[PDB]
Write an enzyme that holds these catalytic residues in place. Structure first.
Site: not given
Ligand SMILES: CC(C)S[C@@H]1O[C@H](CO)[C@H](O)[C@H](O)[C@H]1O
Ligand SMILES: [Mg+2]
Ligand SMILES: [Mg+2]
Ligand code: NA
Ligand SMILES: CC(C)S[C@@H]1O[C@H](CO)[C@H](O)[C@H](O)[C@H]1O
Ligand SMILES: [Mg+2]
Ligand SMILES: [Mg+2]
Ligand SMILES: [Mg+2]
Ligand SMILES: [Mg+2]
Ligand SMILES: [Mg+2]
Ligand SMILES: [Mg+2]
Ligand code: NA
Ligand code: NA
Ligand code: NA
Ligand code: NA
Ligand code: NA
Lengths: 1011, 204, 193
Positions: A345, A379, A406, A449, A525, A585, A589, A592
Site C-alpha cells: 500500500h 489495491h 468489500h 474484494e 495475498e 474501527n 488490523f 500487517n
Molecule cells: C478479516 C477478514 C474477514 S478480511 C481480510 O482482512 C485482512 C486484514 O488485514 C485483509 O484486508 C484481507 O485482504 C481481507 O481478506
Molecule cells: Mg471494532
Molecule cells: Mg477488503
Molecule cells: Na489489514
C-alpha cells in the site's frame, strides 16, 4: 446537482486519459528524461479551509481567499494536518451503506492557490492542470469560473484551463469532498483519509499535439528478433506536412528510427484513422527486460513538420519482454516465472498516503535486498513514479484498478449491477490508458474484494481486447472465475482446504487439479504478516518449488499502516485503529507488514528473504551442489563462502567463485575435513555474497545461506571428582542446599525454587515456576473481541479452559541426599473448575560442581486445548548488558518460523532480544538453544527461550508498545516446547497441526549453573 | 432484438465504439434492452447494434450479455461479420458464390465463408436480397444454398416495408414521397424504400 | 448544463430498467393479462409548441400552458404534424460530425399535459411515469419542478413522481430535443424524426 451522489456522473469536462506526458520541445531532453520546461509543478504552499459539508462553503471563496484559511503544504491528506480524524475500518464501510448517497455531514476541504502564468503559455497552445490524486471527489474553479469535476481518487484528473487563465496572477479553487458515490468503490482495508494527496501540475501542449501513444514489442520464437510497434495519435489540424518520427535508443546508440505522415490503414468500410499512424521498427538481438536484468531502451516520439521543425516530443522507457500464459504456465520471455511478491500500500507514518521518491526507493531497495521480484499495487493505481522505478530497478508489477466494495452484502451487489458499469469501467480503462507502456506492469487486475459480477466479465474482456500483451487477473467470487486468467486466491493454505460455501479456499496443491482446471495459480495475498507472524512460510515455498503451476504469490503485506501520534511530552508513538477516536474501527488490523512504518524490518522479513533465495543447495560428501533459480542471468556477481564450526567455534572456511548459468548447477568440492579436537556437533554454513555493489545493493550483500550438520562426536567423558558435596538443611518450611558460596532454597509449601543466592546476593525476584501460556499473539487473538468474543480463536480456547487462571497445586515435595549431591523431587497439578489441566513432575539435582540439573516431565490432559508452551519462568534479580547463546539466531525465531535462523554462537545487547511489535505480545523467542548465558548465569539443554524486561503478564495487559515499562530485573522464559505462531491468516486458527503441542506427555531437561 | 446503437457515418466506422469514453452510453443501450426483454420467448438472439464497426466496447458488451443471459446467442455484424463479438457469422449482402474481397472487411461468398481456415460458426445473413424496387433477382440461389449447407441457416431479407411517406397535392390528393420531398438535404432519395411491401402493406 | 452534449450524462434520476409491469392487485387479472387499474395510459391530447432551440423556450412554460400552443395527439412524431421536416439520409449524419456537440439550432418540442391523479394513488405507494419512446433526449418537469432527463430514443425512461404530484390536477412539462449526443448512436438508415 449533487454530482457526488450520482454514479452516472464521474466527471465533468475532464480530459481523456493517456500515458505520462511532458511536452518536451527538444528531442534530446526527451531522450534523456530531463525536466521539461513545459511541465510545471504546482506543489508547495496552498491555502486551505476545512468545512463540515459542502453547503457551508461561502460563495466568497470562489473569488477570494478566506482570511480564516491556513497555509499548508500540498500534496497532503488533511487528516495528517489535524483538521479531522483519519478512520481505520477494514471491511465495514466508514459511512452508512445507502448507495449512492453519502452523509450530509461531509467533510469538505477548500483548497486554493494564487499563482502566476506566463503569457507565453497562453499566447499559443493548450494549458491544462493535472491533479494526480484527489480523495475522493472534487469541483474545480479557476479565476472564479467553474471548470469541471472528477472522481476516482487514484488516477489523474486533467482539465483544460486555456480559456480560464490570464497572464500573471491567477487563482485556483478546489472543493474536495471526503465522501462521494466514488467511496462505494473505495472500500480498501486501510486508513480512510482525504485531500489533494498526489502531485498537482500544469502542462503546456501545442495545439497540434501527440494525444496518445502505445508501444508494443513482439518477438520471434527464440526472442532473437523483435518488432517495436508505436501507434501514435494526434489532436489538432491535420496537415499533409505533418510527420511522426519514432526513434529507439540503447543508451547513446540509436538503434532504430522511422518516420511517416499521419494516416492509418483501412479499419472498416468507412476507412481508417487519418489522425493516427503506426511506426514499425526492427530490432535484432534485443537486450531483454526482466526483474533479473531490467534492460531498457528509450523510445522518443517526435511530432514534426516535413521540413524538420519539431512541434513536440513525448517519450518512454521501453523494456522488450513478452508475457504469456501457455500450457498453464505464466511465462516471461518464454520462461516460467516464480513470483517472490509482496502487496504494498502507499503509506507513510507522518505523511499518510502521500508518497515521495525517497520512500519509494527505500522500499524498492529493501524489497530487492530481501529477494522479492514482484509487487502488487494493493489495491489501486499507484503514484506514477512508482512504475518508473519498477521499470528501472526491475520488479514485476500487478497494476490494479481502484475498485473495492468489500462492505457490500453480498460482495458483488454493485459489481453485478449495470448501473455501476460506467463508474467501474472508468476505473479500469483509465488505468490501462495511463500505464500500458510500462514494461514493469506484467498483469492487470480488475480490483479487489468486490465479489464477482457481470461488470467484471465485461471489463476483463475489454482489457483482453485492447491489450493482449498482459494477462488479466481478479480474485473476487472464488478466485477462479471467468474474469481471471490466473487462479489467484487470498490466504488459501498449502495442504489444508477451507471449503466455505460458494467461495471455498482449496489447498493450493489441490486447486490446480480440480476437474477441468488448467490455469496457473499465484496467490494474490498470502502469509498475513500481522505482528509475530509468517509461521509456515517455508511450507508455501516448498510447494511453489515442487509444483510447476504453483508460481508463487504476494505476501500480505509490505509495511505496517501505523500513524505517528505525540504524547503529552511531545514524544512520538505508533497508533492504530481507534487511536484517533475513529469509531467504529478495526484496531490493530491495519498493521500487517513485514516492515514497521518507518522501514525497520520485523523479524519475519528475514524468513521471507531466505525462503525466496535464488540459489538452492544440496550436500553430498564434500560436495555442495548449487542450483540457480535465475531464469535469465548468470551468477556473475556472486561468490560462495563456506565455514565449518564446532559448536560455534570456527574450524575452517573458504570461498569459491560461483559460475552457474540460469537454471544450471555447480558442484564445489569442499577440502579434506581435518578432524576435530573436541566433542560437539560440526556445522557447515554457506553464504552467497555479491562482491560488487549494484543499483540496489552494496558490495558484500548476502543474498542466500544454508546450513547442514556434519559429523557429531557425543561426549563420553565422565566429568570429574567433585571438589565438594553440597549440604542439605531441612526445616519445616524449606529445603535449603548450600555449596560453597551458593545457596538454593526450595519452599516446601509451594514446591518451587523460590530463591538462590550467590554470596549474599539474591538472584530471583520471583520463583522458578512452570508456565503453560503466552501473552497472546495477534494470530492467537484473531478476530476475537471484548465486545464479541470469537470462541474459536486460540486465545479464547485457552481462556475458557482456564489456562491463564490455573493455579499450581502441590502433590509432592521431597529431598534426598545422594553420595555427591542432593536431589529435590516435586510434583504439581494445575487445575481449573476441578479439572486437572497439567501435571508437572520434576527433579533438581545439585552436585558438588554447583550445577543444578533440572528434569521436567509434563502431562497435558488430552481434552484441554493444546497449550501455547511447556516451560519454566522466573524473574531474575539482575539486569545484564548482553545475552549470549549457542542456538538459532540471531533474530527472533519460532518453531514454524525458524528456517532463516542459523545455529551458531550469538551475542546481542539485551534490548535486541525484545521485538517491539506495536501491539505487544509474546515475542523474542530463540529456538534450538543448547547454551544460554546471562550475567553470571548459564543454562544448558535443548530449549527455546526469551529474555526481556517485560513479564508475559505485562505484554498481555498492554495494548501499545509505548506504554510498556521495564520491570525490575529480567524476565526469562525457558521453554522445553513452544507452539507455532501461525499466520496463514490472522482471523482464524492458523497454526498447523504439526506445530501444536498435542503429544500429551513432554520431557525436557536443563542445567543451571554459574559463570 | 437489437441495441439502439448505429454509428455508420463515423470515419472510420468504429471511431466511437472503440472509444472507452463512449462505453457508458453504449452500455446502457445494450443492458437496458436485455433487462427489458429477456423474459420474451420470441427473442432468440441478442444483437449489439448495427454498422458501428468493431470496437472494444463491443467486445465488453458481448461478454456482458453472455454473462447475464447464457440462454441466447449474441450476434453483431460490424467489422467484418465474423469478429470476436459475434457467435454467428452474420454478414450483410454477402453473395452466394461470388466473393467481394474488400480490404479489411471482405464479404466472402457464403459457402466459402463457412469453411475458411479455423472457422466453425453457423452463418445467418443479417441482411440480404436488397428488395429496392424491382428486385429480389437471384433469391432462389440463396435458398438453394441454405438447403444444401447445414451451416447456412438462412437470413433476414432487407427489408419488410418501404419507408415512403404520404404527402398531399395541390388538389389534396395523396402521394408517396421519399428522400428530398420534404426539402430535406442532403438526402438519399429513394434509398428509403427497400421493402417487400408498399408502405400501406400492399405487396410488391 | 447542456446535458444533451455530454455522452457521460445519458439520464438523470431515471429508474432502473425491468420487464413489463402492470402491478395487478388481483391475481386472476394477472393470469389472463387483463388491463390493470394500476397501469394508466396518458395517451391522447396533449399541448405542444415548437421552438428552434432550447434557448428559445420561455420559463413561463414550466408553470403554465403557452397560449400559442396547439392541441395534438401523443404519441406522435412532430414532423408528421408539419412542425418541421423529416430528413431522409442513409449513412451521412444529418448533423455535422463533431461529437459530442450538436447544432445550435436544435428543434425543441415542448409538450405538456394537465391530468388528474386520485388521492388513492398518493396516500400509499409509488407513482411513476413511463415514456416508452422519446426522440432523442428530453427533460421532464412536474408541477413546475424538475424531475429528470433521458436519452436512448428506443427504450422506456421511467421517473418516480411520488413526491411531485398532488391530488386532482397536475401538469407535466416535457422539453424534447431533436438532436443530442445520443444522436451520434442513432444513425440508422431511416427517416430522422
Ligand atoms: C478479516 C477478514 C474477514 S478480511 C481480510 O482482512 C485482512 C486484514 O488485514 C485483509 O484486508 C484481507 O485482504 C481481507 O481478506
Ligand atoms: Mg471494532
Ligand atoms: Mg477488503
Ligand atoms: Na489489514
Ligand atoms: C449503400 C451502402 C454503402 S450502405 C447499405 O445501404 C442500404 C440502403 O438501403 C442499407 O441501409 C444497408 O444496411 C447498408 O449496408
Ligand atoms: Mg458522482
Ligand atoms: Mg443526395
Ligand atoms: Mg448527454
Ligand atoms: Mg377493477
Ligand atoms: Mg389542485
Ligand atoms: Mg446504416
Ligand atoms: Na512452481
Ligand atoms: Na560469479
Ligand atoms: Na498485548
Ligand atoms: Na442450411
Ligand atoms: Na435503405
Amino acid at each position: 446537482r449533487r454530482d457526488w451522489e450520482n454514479p452516472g456522473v464521474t466527471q465533468l469536462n475532464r480530459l481523456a486519459a493517456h500515458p505520462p506526458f511532458a511536452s518536451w520541445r527538444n528531442s534530446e531532453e526527451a531522450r534523456t528524461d530531463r525536466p521539461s520546461q513545459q511541465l510545471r509543478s504546482l506543489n508547495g504552499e496552498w491555502r486551505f479551509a476545512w468545512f463540515p459539508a459542502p453547503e457551508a462553503v461561502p460563495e466568497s471563496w470562489l473569488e477570494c481567499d478566506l482570511p480564516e484559511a491556513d497555509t499548508v503544504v500540498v500534496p497532503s491528506n488533511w487528516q495528517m494536518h489535524g483538521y479531522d480524524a483519519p478512520i481505520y475500518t477494514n471491511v465495514t464501510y466508514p459511512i452508512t451503506v445507502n448507495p449512492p448517497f453519502v452523509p450530509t455531514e461531509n467533510p469538505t476541504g477548500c483548497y486554493s492557490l494564487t499563482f502566476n502564468v506566463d503569457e507565453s503559455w497562453l499566447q499559443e497552445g493548450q494549458t491544462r492542470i493535472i491533479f494526480d490524486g484527489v480523495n475522493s471527489a472534487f469541483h474545480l474553479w479557476c479565476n472564479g469560473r467553474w471548470v469541471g469535476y472528477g472522481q476516482d481518487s487514484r488516477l489523474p484528473s486533467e482539465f483544460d484551463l486555456s480559456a480560464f487563465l490570464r497572464a500573471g496572477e491567477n487563482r485556483l479553487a478546489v472543493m474536495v469532498l471526503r465522501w462521494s458515490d466514488g467511496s462505494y468503490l473505495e472500500d480498501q482495508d486501510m486508513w480512510r483519509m482525504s485531500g489533494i494527496f498526489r502531485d498537482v501540475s500544469l502542462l503546456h501542449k501545442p495545439t497540434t499535439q501527440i494525444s496518445d501513444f502505445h508501444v508494443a514489442t513482439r518477438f520471434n520464437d527464440d526472442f532473437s528478433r523483435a518488432v517495436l510497434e508505436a501507434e501514435v495519435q494526434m489532436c489538432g489540424e491535420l496537415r499533409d506536412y505533418l510527420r511522426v518520427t519514432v526513434s529507439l535508443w540503447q543508451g547513446e546508440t540509436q538503434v532504430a528510427s522511422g518516420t511517416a505522415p499521419f494516416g492509418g490503414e483501412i479499419i472498416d468500410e468507412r476507412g481508417g484513422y487519418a489522425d493516427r499512424v503506426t511506426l514499425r521498427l526492427n530490432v535484432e538481438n534485443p537486450k531483454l527486460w526482466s526483474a533479473e536484468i531490467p534492460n531498457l531502451y528509450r523510445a522518443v516520439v517526435e511530432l514534426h513538420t516535413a521540413d524538420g521543425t519539431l512541434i513536440e516530443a513525448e517519450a518512454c522507457d521501453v523494456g522488450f519482454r513478452e508475457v504469456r500464459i501457455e500450457n498453464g504456465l505464466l511465462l516471461l520471455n518464454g520462461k516460467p516465472l516464480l513470483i517472490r511478491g509482496v502487496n504494498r500500500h502507499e503509506h507513510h507514518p507522518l505523511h499518510g498516503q502521500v508518497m515521495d521518491e525517497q520512500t519509494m526507493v527505500q522500499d524498492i531497495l529493501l524489497m530487492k535486498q530481501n529477494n522479492f521480484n514482484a509487487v502488487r499495487c494493493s489495491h489501486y493505481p499507484n503514484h506514477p513514479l512508482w512504475y518508473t522505478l519498477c521499470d528501472r530497478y526491475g520488479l514485476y508489477v500487478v497494476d490494479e484498478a481502484n475498485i473495492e466494495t468489500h462492505g457490500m452484502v453480498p460482495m458483488n451487489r454493485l459489481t453485478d449491477d449495470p448501473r455501476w458499469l460506467p463508474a467501474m469501467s472508468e476505473r479500469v480503462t483509465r488505468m490501462v490508458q495511463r500505464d500500458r507502456n510500462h514494461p514493469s506492469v506484467i498483469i492487470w487486475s480488475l480490483g479487489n474484494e468486490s465479489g464477482h459480477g457481470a461488470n467484471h466479465d465485461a471489463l476483463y474482456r475489454w482489457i483482453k481486447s485492447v491489450d493482449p500483451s498482459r494477462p488479466v487477473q481478479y480474485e473476487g467470487g472464488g478466485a477462479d472465475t471467468t474474469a481471471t486468467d490466473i487462479i489467484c486466491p487470498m490466504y488459501a493454505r498449502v495442504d489444508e482446504d477451507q471449503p466455505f460455501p460458494a467461495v471455498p479456499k482449496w489447498s493450493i496443491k489441490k486447486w490446480l487439479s480440480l476437474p477441468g482446471e488448467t490455469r496457473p495459480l499465484i496467490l494474490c495475498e498470502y502469509a498475513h504478516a500481522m505482528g509475530n507472524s509468517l509461521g509456515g512460510f517455508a511450507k508455501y515455498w516448498q510447494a511453489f518449488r515442487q509444483y510447476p503451476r504453483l508460481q508463487g504469490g504476494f505476501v500480505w503485506d509490505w509495511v505496517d499502516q501505523s500513524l505517528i501520534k505525540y504524547d503529552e511530552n511531545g514524544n512520538p508513538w505508533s497508533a492504530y485503529g481507534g487511536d484517533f477516536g475513529d469509531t467504529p474501527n478495526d484496531r490493530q488490523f491495519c498493521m500487517n507488514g513485514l516492515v514497521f512504518a518507518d522501514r525497520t524490518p520485523h523479524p519475519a522479513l528475514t524468513e521471507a528473504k531466505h525462503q525466496q533465495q535464488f540459489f538452492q543447495f544440496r550436500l553430498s560428501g564434500q560436495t555442495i551442489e548449487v542450483t540457480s533459480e535465475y531464469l535469465f542471468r548468470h551468477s556473475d556477481n556472486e561468490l560462495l563462502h563456506w565455514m565449518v564450526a564446532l559448536d560455534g567455534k570456527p574450524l575452517a572456511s573458504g570461498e569459491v567463485p560461483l559460475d552457474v548459468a540460469p537454471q544450471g548447477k555447480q558442484l564445489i568440492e569442499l577440502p579434506e575435513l581435518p578432524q576435530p579436537e573436541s566433542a560437539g556437533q560440526l556445522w557447515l554454513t554457506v553464504r552467497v555474497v555479491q562482491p560488487n555493489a549494484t543499483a540496489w545493493s552494496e558490495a558484500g550483500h548476502i543474498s542466500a545461506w544454508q546450513q547442514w550438520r556434519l559429523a557429531e562426536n557425543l561426549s563420553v567423558t565422565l566429568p570429574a571428582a567433585s571438589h565438594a558435596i553440597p549440604h542439605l538443611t531441612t526445616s519445616e518450611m524449606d529445603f535449603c542446599i548450600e555449596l560453597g558460596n551458593k545457596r538454593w532454597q526450595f519452599n516446601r509449601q509451594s514446591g518451587f525454587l523460590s530463591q538462590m543466592w550467590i554470596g549474599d546476593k539474591k538472584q530471583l525476584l520471583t520463583p522458578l515456576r512452570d508456565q503453560f501460556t503466552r501473552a497472546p499473539l495477534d494470530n492467537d487473538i484473531a478476530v476475537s473481541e471484548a465486545t464479541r468474543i470469537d470462541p474459536n480463536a486460540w486465545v479464547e480456547r485457552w481462556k475458557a479452559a482456564g489456562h491463564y487462571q490455573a493455579e499450581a497445586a502441590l502433590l509432592q515435595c521431597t529431598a534426598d541426599t545422594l553420595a555427591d549431591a542432593v536431589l529435590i523431587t516435586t510434583a504439581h497439578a494445575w487445575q481449573h473448575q476441578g479439572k486437572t489441566l497439567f501435571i508437572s513432575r520434576k527433579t533438581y539435582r545439585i552436585d558438588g560442581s554447583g550445577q543444578m540439573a533440572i528434569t521436567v516431565d509434563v502431562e497435558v490432559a488430552s481434552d484441554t486445548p493444546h497449550p501455547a508452551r511447556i516451560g519454566l519462568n522466573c524473574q531474575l534479580a539482575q539486569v545484564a548488558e548482553r545475552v549470549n547463546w549457542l542456538g538459532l539466531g540471531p533474530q527472533e525465531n519460532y518453531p514454524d518460523r525458524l528456517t532463516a535462523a542459523c545455529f551458531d554462537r550469538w551475542d546481542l545487547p539485551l534490548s535486541d532480544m525484545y521485538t517491539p511489535y506495536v501491539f505487544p505480545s509474546e515475542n523474542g523467542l530463540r529456538c534450538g538453544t543448547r547454551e544460554l548465558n546471562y550475567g553470571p548465569h548459564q543454562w544448558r539443554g535443548d530449549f527455546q527461550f526469551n529474555i526481556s524486561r517485560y513479564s508475559q503478564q505485562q505484554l498481555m495487559e498492554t495494548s501499545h508498545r509505548h506504554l510498556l515499562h521495564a520491570e525490575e530485573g529480567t524476565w526469562l522464559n525457558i521453554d522445553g516446547f513452544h507452539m507455532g505462531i501461525g499466520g496463514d491468516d490472522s482471523w482464524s486458527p492458523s497454526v498447523s497441526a504439526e506445530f501444536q503441542l498435542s503429544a500429551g506427555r513432554y520431557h525436557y531437561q536443563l542445567v543451571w549453573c554459574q559463570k
